[PDB]
């Protein structure tokens, strides 16, 4: 039946997207400095988080360590220790007040800003790898047992439970209609979830390696992953096939984290060579490089305005760029 | 006005954690790994989701952390251990069938990305089960060159012959390819393994500072 | 999608939806009753080859690159030897933990061997 599928799939194609890009104005070159620099972590940063109101972020360490950054001032506003060292990701409520984190301890914490533990989620048996915020009432998180969850914080119980894969999740992104979701994990594949229902709607197939970041388009009906064959691909829900590809010869390192601009006419990737790359999202060129960390890359985020970027890596700083 | 109250706060948190950084620097960290087999929760009693052991020797103390509670893959949170100091590894030596797996995790171990410049202390425990189980298998249909290796013990030399040809097959791959190898003998009853890691951390930390003083 | 194919006494394993050139791969049994147990690997260009002690001077693996395919021959067989055989790829290219696995993600369905 699968080759059915591949045989519609090829029915499906008329002309590839590099074709269709002969007539429209280039981006150009593109230049970015670092702006500020913020500087009081002691190990590795581990992921981060930019706020509603572009201004305040999060950032988790990996020596027990949560502190809130203002962009701004470089002030620090909050740092609230953890009771487990080992954590591996964060969230922003959106409505500023609630904060997350989770990893190695198999609990989900959650964190009220009006500092103690508002609420703690124990209901998996792998270690959380993503974690988002739908409202203040419900959280979405994903596990290393193939698992993928929606919670009630009241309540304090798991409502849903998504159990479509194979191999680890390791990163999910809600869509801006907070309707779907999409989630990628260790078996090339990534899967588009219904909050609703609770079923998987479409599965998709086309890298080789673990998919490492995935994020929803601005539009809302395409995504972009970044896997470990040095290659990001964009997809799109309803050709249902691999619409695009951005790969060069000289890189042999995986992806950690990929985002778009406001628009979406770029596509920022960061990687294990102690650099980030600025492709172009529908000509299929690199157009921009940002180096200036001196280990790896390991998390990344644009604001809600599109006026900021912010890189962190294992060199236990963070750095904003405009 | 507002820019005061933020001054204020901010000058408090880089106070407290300045103290953070008198305690972290003070403490090594040290991951112990092994097999089901293997006695490694023996050997975590005796000084004393994921569970952790402090212990105090000549006035350092060591955190030291037996972690599991995932599935069988273990190729991405291994990765969160990169400044640990040391990796402890305990194999059973009186298991063949399962030798094979601790030295192909012990390649895996050596040859990654993340974790070529983090030193590895050897302990090959259960050793008078071996005693016992040799003197009474035959430790040559698993492995095909016992047969002709010589020796680089109370009644008969081949329990020596034994011993230093699994921590010579050991060894051949760790000098097959920064970072050093510290074999040890350790029975079941031992109350001198907290004094070989700190004589191991001391050596791999003084080899460390070697090179950072700028004199090679 | 990756796709690993065995037939079979010359043991084939192809291979498609991936690059054969960058990947190190193996060989792994499974015993009736009995655990995974890893067979044999071979290197990229095919230059580093190790066997398990068992095995060592009794088998011999292949790999040919122009067709992407993985080839074992295997001779002077025992009843120890009656099991499932899988060809397995371990994930990261240019370097590779987990081939040994319940639930392996990048490995085949096997074939029975009963001598």
């Known amino acids: 039946l699968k080759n059915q599928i591949r045989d519609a799939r090829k029915a499906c194609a008329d002309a590839t997207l590099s074709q269709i890009t002969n007539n429209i104005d280039p981006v150009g070159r593109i230049q970015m400095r670092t702006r500020r620099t913020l500087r009081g972590h002691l190990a590795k940063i581990y992921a981060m988080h930019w706020g509603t109101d572009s201004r305040l972020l999060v950032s988790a360490s990996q020596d027990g360590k949560l502190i809130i950054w203002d962009s701004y001032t470089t002030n620090k506003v909050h740092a609230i220790p953890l009771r487990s060292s080992w954590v591996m990701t964060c969230a922003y409520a959106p409505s500023g007040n609630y904060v997350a984190c989770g990893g190695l301890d198999n609990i989900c914490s959650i964190y009220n800003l009006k500092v103690r533990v508002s609420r703690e989620l124990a209901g998996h048996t792998g270690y959380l790898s993503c974690c988002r915020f739908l409202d203040d009432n419900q959280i979405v998180t994903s596990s290393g047992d193939t698992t993928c969850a929606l919670w009630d914080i009241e309540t304090g119980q798991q409502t849903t439970t998504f159990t479509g894969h194979t191999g680890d999740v390791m990163s999910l992104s809600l869509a801006p209609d907070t309707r779907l979701f999409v989630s990628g994990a260790c078996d090339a594949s990534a899967k588009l979830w219904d909050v609703r229902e609770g079923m998987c709607r479409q599965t998709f197939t086309g890298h080789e390696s673990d998919i490492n970041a995935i994020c929803f388009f601005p539009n809302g009906n395409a995504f972009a992953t970044g896997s470990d064959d040095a290659t990001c691909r964009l997809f799109d829900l309803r050709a249902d096939q691999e619409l695009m590809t951005y790969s060069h010869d000289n890189i042999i390192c995986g992806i950690t984290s990929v985002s778009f601009s406001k628009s979406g006419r770029l596509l920022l990737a960061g990687y294990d060579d102690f650099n980030c790359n600025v492709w172009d999202a529908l000509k299929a060129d690199r157009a921009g490089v940002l180096a200036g960390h001196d280990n790896r890359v390991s998390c990344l985020g644009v604001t809600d305005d599109g006026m900021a970027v912010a890189t962190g890596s294992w060199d236990s700083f963070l750095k904003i760029w405009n | 006005n507002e820019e005061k109250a933020q001054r204020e706060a901010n000058k408090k948190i880089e106070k407290q954690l300045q103290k953070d950084k008198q305690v972290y620097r003070a403490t090594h960290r040290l991951l112990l790994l092994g097999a089901d087999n293997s006695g490694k929760s023996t050997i975590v009693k005796q000084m004393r989701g994921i569970f952790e052991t402090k212990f105090q020797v000549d006035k350092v103390n060591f955190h030291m952390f037996d972690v599991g509670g995932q599935r069988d893959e273990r190729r991405k949170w291994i990765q969160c251990f990169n400044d640990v100091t040391a990796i402890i590894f305990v194999v059973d030596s009186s298991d063949y069938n399962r030798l094979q797996e601790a030295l192909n995790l012990f390649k895996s171990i050596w040859n990654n990305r993340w974790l070529r410049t983090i030193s590895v202390i050897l302990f090959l425990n259960k050793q008078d089960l071996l005693a016992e189980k040799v003197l009474a298998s035959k430790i040559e249909d698993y492995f095909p060159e016992f047969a002709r290796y010589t020796t680089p013990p109370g009644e008969d030399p081949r329990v020596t012959r034994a011993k230093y040809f699994i921590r010579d097959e050991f060894l051949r791959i760790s000098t097959a390819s920064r970072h050093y190898c510290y074999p040890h003998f350790t029975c079941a009853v031992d109350t001198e393994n907290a004094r070989r890691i700190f004589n191991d951390c001391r050596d791999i930390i003084q080899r460390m500072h070697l090179r950072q003083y700028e004199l090679l | 999608q990756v796709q690993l194919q065995e037939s079979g006494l010359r043991l084939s394993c192809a291979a498609s939806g991936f690059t054969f050139s960058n990947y190190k791969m193996n060989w792994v049994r499974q015993a009736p009753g009995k655990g995974l147990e890893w067979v044999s690997d071979?290197?990229?260009?095919?230059?580093?080859?190790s066997y398990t002690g068992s095995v060592k001077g009794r088998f011999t693996i292949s790999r040919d690159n122009a067709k992407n395919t993985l080839y074992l021959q295997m001779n002077s067989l025992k009843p120890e030897d009656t099991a499932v055989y899988y060809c397995?790829?371990?994930?990261?290219?240019?370097?590779?933990?987990?081939?040994?696995?319940?639930?392996?993600?990048?490995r085949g369905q096997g074939t029975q061997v009963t001598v």
């Open positions: 397995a790829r371990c994930p990261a290219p240019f370097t590779c933990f987990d081939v040994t696995s319940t639930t392996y993600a990048y």
């Open positions: 071979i290197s990229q260009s095919g230059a580093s080859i």
